[PDB]
Predict the structure.
Amino acid sequence: SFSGYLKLTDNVYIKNADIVEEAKKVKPTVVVNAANVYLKHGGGVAGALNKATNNAMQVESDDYIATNGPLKVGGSCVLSGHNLAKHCLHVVGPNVNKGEDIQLLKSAYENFNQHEVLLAPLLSAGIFGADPIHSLRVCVDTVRTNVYLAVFDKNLYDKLVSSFL
């Protein structure tokens, strides 16, 4: 199971790790993807998770979008976890670089409450443009289920832990 995590709260854990490497090691029930409404896994966590599945996640996502249309910002969908997890919960946090409403970050994290345990990135952080310190704050104030956060960037991991209230 999950190892080397620092406990932030009763249910939120954090580790400086590559989420793809964590997923291959643990093979959790749910790995969260930092998705966009079109499930186009181009960069950041999405591009990295997709590449680890040999593009199977993108082929599956294209079929999902053809059948159901795009997701909403703040929404999610459960698809296969392929070689990384039992399932992948594709969650759409607001992308500030696309002018999306940062207020939707709480709705995005609420999707985690439908799963007892998850391996996840900080939503809307990285290329999504939001402040990761604010994303961690929304995470601990919204998620009630067991969330194991993987933070790729070492300097950011240290800043998140050191500034955690």
Summary: The two ends are 27 Å apart (CA to CA). The longest helix spans residues 56-68.
